[PDB]
Amino acid sequence: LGGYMLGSAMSRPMMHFGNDWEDRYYRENMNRYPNQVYYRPVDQYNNQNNFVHDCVNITIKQHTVTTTTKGENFTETDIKIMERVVEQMCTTQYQKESQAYYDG
């Protein structure tokens, strides 16, 4: 890949975009969707959003390719779904991996 690691699968998180059409598309397709996240160690970072930018990138990059070959067809919609859940889970796993950096 280049140096990334699938952290965990989120257990159908239940979250809000702020939208309706997005909210629903997650909770109708989340079973098919990438609901895990790939990352580097937080060990060469200090902030969430930029690690998270790498994180959601490699997540979706692997998945979009692989899942397509397995049979799938995401859209800029399914993307903005994935991209949301995966970014909030990337940021949240940074919090987890940071707790584990400190190891509390």
Side-chain angles (χ1 to χ4, degrees):
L1 302 205
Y4 316 90
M5 292 165 297
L6 188 56
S8 269
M10 42 269 208
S11 189
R12 304 125 81 259
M14 306 306 177
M15 43 181 286
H16 246 74
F17 301 77
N19 297 330
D20 190 272
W21 51 77
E22 261 161 53
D23 212 275
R24 59 93 53 184
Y25 203 38
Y26 150 70
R27 65 195 209 249
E28 287 284 288
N29 304 270
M30 62 185 177
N31 190 46
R32 293 85 149 163
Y33 283 154
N35 66 250
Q36 319 199 211
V37 0
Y38 283 67
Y39 42 60
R40 299 294 304 293
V42 286
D43 202 69
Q44 296 130 110
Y45 297 86
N46 66 286
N47 184 32
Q48 251 158 214
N49 55 252
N50 49 281
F51 167 105
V52 168
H53 119 283
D54 278 312
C55 177
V56 295
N57 161 75
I58 184 67
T59 305
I60 287 165
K61 183 173 285 180
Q62 289 309 296
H63 205 84
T64 48
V65 175
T66 309
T67 209
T68 298
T69 67
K70 299 182 70 229
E72 256 198 320
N73 191 75
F74 62 81
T75 58
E76 54 159 296
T77 8
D78 301 277
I79 290 314
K80 257 207 292 195
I81 300 305
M82 287 156 33
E83 293 271 50
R84 212 281 200 287
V85 195
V86 65
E87 172 189 86
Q88 303 305 83
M89 286 294 320
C90 276
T91 237
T92 300
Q93 286 298 119
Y94 195 117
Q95 306 167 25
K96 302 347 198 182
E97 297 270 296
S98 192
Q99 280 174 47
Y101 184 95
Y102 163 74
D103 208 49

